[PDB]
Protein backbone atom coordinates (compact mmCIF):
# COMPACT_ATOMS: atom_id res chain seq x y z
CA UNK A 1 0.00 0.00 0.00
CA UNK A 2 2.91 2.55 0.41
CA UNK A 3 4.08 1.37 -3.22
CA UNK A 4 0.79 2.51 -4.78
CA UNK A 5 0.76 5.81 -2.31
CA UNK A 6 4.17 6.38 -3.59
CA UNK A 7 3.06 6.31 -7.39
CA UNK A 8 -0.13 8.09 -6.99
CA UNK A 9 1.48 11.24 -5.59
CA UNK A 10 4.28 11.04 -8.25
CA UNK A 11 1.68 10.98 -10.66
CA UNK A 12 -0.47 13.60 -9.16
CA UNK A 13 3.23 15.59 -8.91
CA UNK A 14 3.92 15.03 -12.43
CA UNK A 15 0.37 15.65 -13.61
CA UNK A 16 -0.76 19.11 -12.37
CA UNK A 17 1.76 21.10 -14.16
CA UNK A 18 0.53 19.85 -17.61
CA UNK A 19 -2.60 20.77 -16.18
CA UNK A 20 -1.97 24.38 -16.03
CA UNK A 21 0.05 23.80 -19.32
CA UNK A 22 -2.35 22.06 -21.64
CA UNK A 23 -4.52 25.23 -20.77
CA UNK A 24 -1.81 27.73 -21.72
CA UNK A 25 -1.00 25.65 -24.95
CA UNK A 26 -4.92 26.12 -25.62
CA UNK A 27 -5.05 29.58 -25.60
CA UNK A 28 -2.57 30.60 -27.97
CA UNK A 29 -4.66 30.48 -30.71
CA UNK A 30 -7.74 31.56 -28.85
CA UNK A 31 -6.26 34.75 -27.96
CA UNK A 32 -4.16 35.41 -31.10
CA UNK A 33 -7.79 35.15 -32.82
CA UNK A 34 -9.16 37.20 -30.70
CA UNK A 35 -6.74 40.20 -31.32
CA UNK A 36 -7.16 39.52 -34.96
CA UNK A 37 -10.80 39.63 -35.17
CA UNK A 38 -10.81 43.24 -34.50
CA UNK A 39 -8.73 44.07 -37.83
CA UNK A 40 -12.25 43.23 -39.70
CA UNK A 41 -14.03 40.36 -41.23
CA UNK A 42 -11.18 39.30 -43.37
CA UNK A 43 -7.72 39.21 -41.49
CA UNK A 44 -9.77 36.73 -39.18
CA UNK A 45 -10.44 35.14 -42.00
CA UNK A 46 -6.91 34.55 -42.79
CA UNK A 47 -6.47 33.35 -39.32
CA UNK A 48 -9.31 30.48 -39.77
CA UNK A 49 -7.49 29.24 -43.01
CA UNK A 50 -4.11 28.66 -40.88
CA UNK A 51 -6.12 26.46 -38.62
CA UNK A 52 -5.19 23.21 -41.07
CA UNK A 53 -1.54 23.97 -41.84
CA UNK A 54 -1.50 24.46 -37.75
CA UNK A 55 -2.73 21.16 -37.51
CA UNK A 56 -0.62 19.83 -39.61
CA UNK A 57 2.56 21.70 -37.74
CA UNK A 58 1.27 20.36 -34.48
CA UNK A 59 0.81 16.78 -35.33
CA UNK A 60 4.27 16.49 -36.44
CA UNK A 61 5.94 18.47 -33.54
CA UNK A 62 3.76 15.78 -31.02
CA UNK A 63 4.68 12.56 -33.21
CA UNK A 64 8.07 13.28 -32.81
CA UNK A 65 7.23 14.44 -29.09
CA UNK A 66 6.04 11.10 -28.14
CA UNK A 67 8.77 9.42 -29.85
CA UNK A 68 11.92 11.22 -27.89
CA UNK A 69 9.56 10.55 -24.13
CA UNK A 70 9.12 7.57 -25.25
CA UNK A 71 13.04 5.83 -26.17
CA UNK A 72 15.42 8.67 -24.27
CA UNK A 73 13.12 7.88 -21.07
CA UNK A 74 13.69 4.22 -21.54
CA UNK A 75 17.21 4.82 -22.09
CA UNK A 76 17.38 6.61 -18.69
CA UNK A 77 16.06 4.02 -17.19
CA UNK A 78 18.31 1.19 -19.15
CA UNK A 79 21.06 3.28 -17.35
CA UNK A 80 22.00 4.29 -21.25
CA UNK A 81 22.64 7.82 -20.05
CA UNK A 82 25.17 9.24 -22.45
CA UNK A 83 23.43 7.76 -25.01
CA UNK A 84 20.30 9.63 -23.89
CA UNK A 85 21.43 12.91 -24.04
CA UNK A 86 23.29 12.13 -27.39
CA UNK A 87 19.47 11.27 -28.52
CA UNK A 88 18.00 14.57 -26.87
CA UNK A 89 20.63 16.58 -29.12
CA UNK A 90 20.22 14.16 -32.12
CA UNK A 91 16.22 15.09 -31.74
CA UNK A 92 16.76 18.93 -31.63
CA UNK A 93 19.26 18.77 -34.60
CA UNK A 94 16.25 16.38 -36.91
CA UNK A 95 13.35 18.30 -35.25
CA UNK A 96 14.83 21.28 -36.34
CA UNK A 97 15.77 21.07 -40.25
CA UNK A 98 12.49 18.98 -40.70
CA UNK A 99 9.70 21.46 -39.18
CA UNK A 100 11.82 23.71 -41.30
CA UNK A 101 11.49 22.30 -44.70
CA UNK A 102 8.20 21.37 -43.36
CA UNK A 103 7.29 24.83 -43.27
CA UNK A 104 9.37 25.55 -46.09
CA UNK A 105 6.39 23.48 -48.89
CA UNK A 106 3.69 24.34 -47.34
CA UNK A 107 4.30 28.21 -48.18
CA UNK A 108 5.33 26.90 -51.49
CA UNK A 109 2.47 24.94 -52.12
CA UNK A 110 0.32 27.49 -50.41
CA UNK A 111 -1.87 28.58 -53.56
CA UNK A 112 -2.96 25.12 -54.13
CA UNK A 113 -3.21 24.61 -50.52
CA UNK A 114 -5.79 27.08 -49.72
CA UNK A 115 -7.87 26.29 -53.58
CA UNK A 116 -8.54 22.84 -52.23
CA UNK A 117 -9.05 24.55 -48.35
CA UNK A 118 -12.09 26.81 -50.33
CA UNK A 119 -10.80 30.55 -49.43
CA UNK A 120 -11.78 32.87 -51.11
CA UNK A 121 -9.10 34.76 -53.09
CA UNK A 122 -9.33 38.24 -51.21
CA UNK A 123 -7.73 36.03 -48.42
CA UNK A 124 -4.24 34.95 -50.69
CA UNK A 125 -2.79 38.03 -50.61
CA UNK A 126 -2.84 38.27 -46.62
CA UNK A 127 -1.40 34.69 -46.30
CA UNK A 128 1.60 35.68 -48.57
CA UNK A 129 3.16 37.18 -45.67
CA UNK A 130 1.38 36.50 -42.76
CA UNK A 131 2.00 32.80 -43.53
CA UNK A 132 5.89 34.00 -43.81
CA UNK A 133 6.08 35.01 -40.12
CA UNK A 134 3.82 32.50 -38.57
CA UNK A 135 5.61 29.50 -39.63
CA UNK A 136 8.49 31.30 -38.29
CA UNK A 137 6.25 31.51 -35.49
CA UNK A 138 5.55 27.54 -35.79
CA UNK A 139 8.94 26.76 -36.09
CA UNK A 140 10.24 28.68 -32.58
CA UNK A 141 7.63 26.47 -30.78
CA UNK A 142 8.63 23.50 -32.30
CA UNK A 143 11.80 23.73 -31.21
CA UNK A 144 10.79 24.90 -27.69
CA UNK A 145 8.44 21.48 -27.56
CA UNK A 146 11.41 19.71 -28.19
CA UNK A 147 13.40 20.53 -25.48
CA UNK A 148 9.76 20.79 -23.14
CA UNK A 149 10.26 16.87 -24.73
CA UNK A 150 13.72 16.24 -23.48
CA UNK A 151 12.96 17.75 -20.25
CA UNK A 152 9.72 15.34 -19.78
CA UNK A 153 11.61 12.17 -20.72
CA UNK A 154 14.32 12.93 -18.37
CA UNK A 155 11.17 12.85 -15.71
CA UNK A 156 10.28 16.22 -15.12
CA UNK A 157 7.29 18.23 -16.27
CA UNK A 158 7.27 21.24 -13.86
CA UNK A 159 9.92 23.56 -15.91
CA UNK A 160 7.50 23.05 -19.01
CA UNK A 161 4.41 23.41 -17.22
CA UNK A 162 6.29 27.21 -16.05
CA UNK A 163 7.24 27.91 -19.29
CA UNK A 164 3.67 26.99 -20.72
CA UNK A 165 2.34 29.48 -18.21
CA UNK A 166 4.83 32.02 -18.76
CA UNK A 167 5.02 32.03 -22.64
CA UNK A 168 1.82 32.13 -22.67
CA UNK A 169 0.98 35.37 -20.55
CA UNK A 170 3.51 36.73 -22.41
CA UNK A 171 1.75 36.03 -25.93
CA UNK A 172 -0.92 37.57 -24.18
CA UNK A 173 1.20 41.09 -23.52
CA UNK A 174 2.95 41.33 -26.58
CA UNK A 175 0.46 40.73 -29.03
CA UNK A 176 -1.60 44.94 -28.99
CA UNK A 177 2.00 45.99 -28.51
CA UNK A 178 2.69 44.55 -32.09
CA UNK A 179 -0.62 44.56 -33.70
CA UNK A 180 -1.60 48.07 -32.82
CA UNK A 181 1.06 50.11 -31.17
CA UNK A 182 3.60 49.68 -33.76
CA UNK A 183 0.50 49.35 -36.84
CA UNK A 184 1.95 45.76 -38.11
CA UNK A 185 -1.42 44.60 -38.08
CA UNK A 186 -1.88 40.66 -38.15
CA UNK A 187 1.88 39.89 -38.54
CA UNK A 188 2.13 41.80 -35.34
CA UNK A 189 0.29 38.52 -33.71
CA UNK A 190 2.65 36.00 -35.40
CA UNK A 191 5.64 38.15 -34.65
CA UNK A 192 4.55 38.76 -31.00
CA UNK A 193 4.41 34.56 -30.78
CA UNK A 194 7.67 34.09 -32.09
CA UNK A 195 9.41 36.53 -29.38
CA UNK A 196 6.95 34.67 -26.59
CA UNK A 197 8.69 31.18 -27.72
CA UNK A 198 11.93 32.50 -28.54
CA UNK A 199 12.00 33.71 -24.42
CA UNK A 200 10.97 30.05 -23.19
CA UNK A 201 13.79 28.34 -25.81
CA UNK A 202 16.34 31.50 -24.18
CA UNK A 203 15.11 29.69 -20.52
CA UNK A 204 14.91 25.77 -21.25
CA UNK A 205 17.72 25.64 -23.24
CA UNK A 206 20.88 26.78 -20.98
CA UNK A 207 19.01 24.91 -18.15
CA UNK A 208 18.73 21.54 -20.33
CA UNK A 209 22.69 22.26 -21.28
CA UNK A 210 23.44 22.37 -17.31
CA UNK A 211 22.44 18.89 -16.88
CA UNK A 212 23.65 18.10 -19.85
CA UNK A 213 20.40 16.28 -21.04
CA UNK A 214 21.92 17.12 -24.50
CA UNK A 215 24.53 16.59 -26.13
CA UNK A 216 26.10 17.03 -29.50
CA UNK A 217 29.05 15.01 -29.25
CA UNK A 218 28.08 12.01 -32.04
CA UNK A 219 31.19 10.23 -32.10
CA UNK A 220 30.53 6.91 -30.77
CA UNK A 221 26.32 7.26 -31.55
CA UNK A 222 24.56 5.45 -33.98
CA UNK A 223 22.94 7.56 -35.80
CA UNK A 224 20.93 5.74 -38.78
CA UNK A 225 20.06 3.03 -35.76
CA UNK A 226 18.46 6.46 -33.14
CA UNK A 227 17.02 7.49 -36.37
CA UNK A 228 15.24 4.41 -36.63
CA UNK A 229 14.32 3.74 -33.20
CA UNK A 230 12.47 7.52 -33.35
CA UNK A 231 11.06 6.88 -36.41
CA UNK A 232 9.30 3.62 -35.40
CA UNK A 233 7.48 5.49 -32.71
CA UNK A 234 6.73 9.19 -34.70
CA UNK A 235 5.72 7.31 -37.77
CA UNK A 236 2.44 5.44 -36.30
CA UNK A 237 2.14 8.62 -34.04
CA UNK A 238 1.33 11.28 -36.74
CA UNK A 239 -0.61 8.46 -38.84
CA UNK A 240 -2.70 8.58 -35.55
CA UNK A 241 -2.98 12.74 -35.39
CA UNK A 242 -4.81 12.46 -39.06
CA UNK A 243 -7.56 10.06 -37.83
CA UNK A 244 -9.23 12.61 -36.09
CA UNK A 245 -9.97 15.32 -38.92
CA UNK A 246 -10.62 12.15 -41.37
CA UNK A 247 -13.13 11.07 -39.10
CA UNK A 248 -14.75 14.38 -39.25
CA UNK A 249 -15.15 14.59 -42.56
CA UNK A 250 -17.14 11.53 -42.32
CA UNK A 251 -19.22 12.63 -39.62
CA UNK A 252 -19.99 15.99 -40.48
CA UNK A 253 -21.70 14.64 -43.68
CA UNK A 254 -23.84 13.05 -40.99
CA UNK A 255 -24.65 15.80 -38.79
CA UNK A 256 -25.59 17.75 -41.58
CA UNK A 257 -28.59 15.64 -42.23
CA UNK A 258 -29.98 17.46 -38.69
CA UNK A 259 -29.70 20.83 -39.66
CA UNK A 260 -28.02 24.10 -39.13
CA UNK A 261 -28.19 24.06 -35.47
CA UNK A 262 -27.61 20.60 -34.59
CA UNK A 263 -23.88 21.34 -36.75
CA UNK A 264 -23.90 24.69 -34.42
CA UNK A 265 -24.26 22.73 -31.16
CA UNK A 266 -21.48 19.60 -32.12
CA UNK A 267 -18.97 21.82 -32.71
CA UNK A 268 -19.90 23.39 -29.03
CA UNK A 269 -20.76 19.63 -27.66
CA UNK A 270 -17.04 18.96 -28.65
CA UNK A 271 -15.31 21.91 -27.28
CA UNK A 272 -16.66 20.96 -24.34
CA UNK A 273 -15.57 17.48 -24.17
CA UNK A 274 -11.92 18.81 -24.33
CA UNK A 275 -12.25 20.91 -21.59
CA UNK A 276 -14.05 17.59 -19.31
CA UNK A 277 -10.60 15.91 -20.66
CA UNK A 278 -8.30 18.38 -19.66
CA UNK A 279 -7.01 16.03 -17.03
CA UNK A 280 -6.73 12.94 -19.14
CA UNK A 281 -5.02 15.20 -21.67
CA UNK A 282 -2.48 16.22 -19.06
CA UNK A 283 -1.63 12.53 -18.13
CA UNK A 284 -1.03 11.75 -21.80
CA UNK A 285 2.25 13.93 -21.36
CA UNK A 286 2.87 13.41 -17.45
CA UNK A 287 2.26 9.45 -17.70
CA UNK A 288 4.33 8.25 -20.51
CA UNK A 289 8.07 9.46 -19.27
CA UNK A 290 6.84 7.09 -16.14
CA UNK A 291 6.20 4.16 -17.99
CA UNK A 292 8.84 4.44 -20.61
CA UNK A 293 11.48 4.78 -17.54
CA UNK A 294 10.22 1.79 -15.53
CA UNK A 295 9.66 -0.45 -18.96
CA UNK A 296 13.82 0.37 -19.53
CA UNK A 297 14.53 -0.51 -15.57
CA UNK A 298 12.70 -3.65 -15.79
CA UNK A 299 9.82 -2.43 -12.96
CA UNK A 300 6.91 -4.08 -14.80
CA UNK A 301 5.31 -4.31 -11.46
CA UNK A 302 5.55 -0.82 -11.06
CA UNK A 303 4.05 -0.24 -14.61
CA UNK A 304 0.82 -2.73 -13.95
CA UNK A 305 0.26 -0.22 -10.28
CA UNK A 306 0.76 3.16 -12.01
CA UNK A 307 -1.56 2.48 -14.93
CA UNK A 308 -4.06 0.64 -12.42
CA UNK A 309 -4.14 4.03 -10.09
CA UNK A 310 -3.95 6.37 -13.60
CA UNK A 311 -7.52 4.44 -14.44
CA UNK A 312 -9.02 4.53 -11.51
CA UNK A 313 -8.65 8.13 -10.81
CA UNK A 314 -9.88 8.85 -14.57
CA UNK A 315 -12.65 6.29 -13.71
CA UNK A 316 -14.36 8.26 -10.83
CA UNK A 317 -12.98 11.95 -11.69
CA UNK A 318 -14.99 11.77 -14.85
CA UNK A 319 -17.83 10.40 -13.47
CA UNK A 320 -18.21 13.55 -11.27
CA UNK A 321 -17.69 15.93 -13.81
CA UNK A 322 -20.77 13.81 -15.79
CA UNK A 323 -23.18 14.38 -12.34
CA UNK A 324 -21.86 18.02 -11.97
CA UNK A 325 -22.45 18.85 -15.84
CA UNK A 326 -25.81 16.69 -15.27
CA UNK A 327 -27.54 18.87 -13.09
CA UNK A 328 -26.04 22.32 -14.48
CA UNK A 329 -26.78 21.35 -18.42
CA UNK A 330 -29.41 23.68 -19.04
CA UNK A 331 -27.29 26.60 -18.07
CA UNK A 332 -24.37 25.65 -19.49
CA UNK A 333 -26.31 25.22 -23.08
CA UNK A 334 -28.06 28.59 -22.81
CA UNK A 335 -24.25 30.40 -21.60
CA UNK A 336 -22.42 28.74 -24.50
CA UNK A 337 -25.18 29.99 -27.49
CA UNK A 338 -27.81 32.40 -27.62
CA UNK A 339 -29.78 30.45 -30.01
CA UNK A 340 -33.21 28.08 -28.63
CA UNK A 341 -32.85 25.60 -31.53
CA UNK A 342 -28.82 25.09 -30.44
CA UNK A 343 -28.98 25.40 -26.56
CA UNK A 344 -31.90 22.69 -26.59
CA UNK A 345 -29.38 20.51 -28.55
CA UNK A 346 -26.58 21.02 -26.68
CA UNK A 347 -28.87 20.35 -23.53
CA UNK A 348 -29.50 16.74 -25.00
CA UNK A 349 -26.03 16.24 -25.46
CA UNK A 350 -24.58 17.57 -21.90
CA UNK A 351 -26.93 15.33 -20.24
CA UNK A 352 -25.92 12.29 -22.30
CA UNK A 353 -21.99 11.97 -23.77
CA UNK A 354 -20.50 12.94 -20.45
CA UNK A 355 -20.51 9.85 -18.79
CA UNK A 356 -18.83 7.90 -21.40
CA UNK A 357 -15.97 10.44 -21.21
CA UNK A 358 -14.58 8.12 -18.69
CA UNK A 359 -13.90 5.24 -20.80
CA UNK A 360 -13.09 7.33 -23.82
CA UNK A 361 -10.28 9.23 -21.28
CA UNK A 362 -8.95 5.31 -20.87
CA UNK A 363 -8.59 5.02 -24.38
CA UNK A 364 -6.59 8.16 -24.48
CA UNK A 365 -4.38 6.80 -21.76
CA UNK A 366 -3.84 3.40 -23.40
CA UNK A 367 -2.63 4.88 -26.62
CA UNK A 368 -0.15 6.87 -24.80
CA UNK A 369 0.72 4.33 -22.42
CA UNK A 370 1.52 1.89 -25.54
CA UNK A 371 3.79 4.40 -27.18
CA UNK A 372 5.89 4.95 -23.99
CA UNK A 373 6.09 0.89 -24.41
CA UNK A 374 7.63 1.23 -28.40
CA UNK A 375 4.24 -0.58 -28.81
CA UNK A 376 3.38 2.36 -31.98
CA UNK A 377 1.58 0.32 -33.92
CA UNK A 378 -0.63 -1.26 -31.18
CA UNK A 379 -0.96 2.68 -30.19
CA UNK A 380 -2.28 3.36 -33.97
CA UNK A 381 -4.58 0.56 -33.94
CA UNK A 382 -6.24 1.57 -30.79
CA UNK A 383 -7.08 5.09 -32.44
CA UNK A 384 -7.98 3.43 -35.28
CA UNK A 385 -10.33 0.90 -33.84
CA UNK A 386 -12.32 4.05 -31.45
CA UNK A 387 -12.93 6.34 -34.57
CA UNK A 388 -13.52 3.78 -37.57
CA UNK A 389 -14.70 0.66 -35.67
CA UNK A 390 -16.38 1.80 -32.59
CA UNK A 391 -17.37 5.36 -32.97
CA UNK A 392 -18.47 6.69 -36.53
CA UNK A 393 -20.57 2.86 -36.80
CA UNK A 394 -22.59 3.83 -33.42
CA UNK A 395 -22.96 7.18 -34.14
CA UNK A 396 -25.01 6.44 -37.69
CA UNK A 397 -26.92 3.46 -36.31
CA UNK A 398 -27.91 5.82 -33.66
CA UNK A 399 -28.75 8.67 -35.85
CA UNK A 400 -30.75 6.23 -38.07
CA UNK A 401 -32.66 4.30 -35.40
CA UNK A 402 -33.68 7.55 -32.78
CA UNK A 403 -32.50 10.29 -34.49
CA UNK A 404 -30.83 13.40 -32.41
CA UNK A 405 -30.75 11.86 -29.42
CA UNK A 406 -30.25 8.37 -30.87
CA UNK A 407 -26.61 9.84 -32.35
CA UNK A 408 -25.69 11.23 -28.59
CA UNK A 409 -26.52 7.78 -27.28
CA UNK A 410 -24.45 6.02 -30.25
CA UNK A 411 -21.60 8.59 -29.02
CA UNK A 412 -21.62 7.21 -25.46
CA UNK A 413 -21.91 3.51 -26.63
CA UNK A 414 -18.84 3.92 -28.87
CA UNK A 415 -16.88 5.34 -26.08
CA UNK A 416 -17.77 2.55 -24.15
CA UNK A 417 -16.90 -0.37 -26.19
CA UNK A 418 -13.91 2.06 -27.32
CA UNK A 419 -12.37 2.50 -23.72
CA UNK A 420 -13.20 -1.70 -23.27
CA UNK A 421 -11.30 -2.50 -26.31
CA UNK A 422 -8.00 -0.32 -25.10
CA UNK A 423 -7.84 -2.00 -21.85
CA UNK A 424 -7.84 -5.21 -23.64
CA UNK A 425 -4.94 -4.09 -25.89
CA UNK A 426 -2.82 -2.29 -23.06
CA UNK A 427 -2.90 -5.95 -21.33
CA UNK A 428 -2.12 -7.70 -23.93
CA UNK A 429 1.02 -5.10 -24.66
CA UNK A 430 2.13 -5.54 -20.91
CA UNK A 431 2.67 -9.08 -21.11
CA UNK A 432 5.15 -8.53 -24.08
CA UNK A 433 7.39 -7.37 -21.82
CA UNK A 434 6.65 -10.44 -19.02
CA UNK A 435 10.14 -11.67 -19.92
CA UNK A 436 11.43 -8.93 -18.23
CA UNK A 437 9.16 -9.48 -15.35
CA UNK A 438 12.14 -9.38 -11.79
Known amino acids: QTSTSSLAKQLFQMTWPMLFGVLSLMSFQLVDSAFIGQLGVLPLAAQGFTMPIQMVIIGIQVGLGIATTAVISRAIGAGKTEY ?21 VLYLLRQPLLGLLGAPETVFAIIDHYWLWWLASAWTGAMLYFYYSVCRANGNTLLPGTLMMVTSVLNLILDPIFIFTFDLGIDGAAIATIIAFGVGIAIVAPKVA ?40 FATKLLASFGTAAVAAWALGSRFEFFALVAVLAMTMSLPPMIGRMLGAKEITHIRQLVRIACQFVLGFQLLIALVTYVFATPLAELMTSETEVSQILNLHLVIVPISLGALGICMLMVSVANALGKSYVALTISALRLFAFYLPCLWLGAHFYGIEGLFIGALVGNIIAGWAAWLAYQKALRSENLYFQ
Open 84 to 104: AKQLGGLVIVIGGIGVALIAL
Open 210 to 249: QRQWTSYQWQDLNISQSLTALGHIMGPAMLSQLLPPLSSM
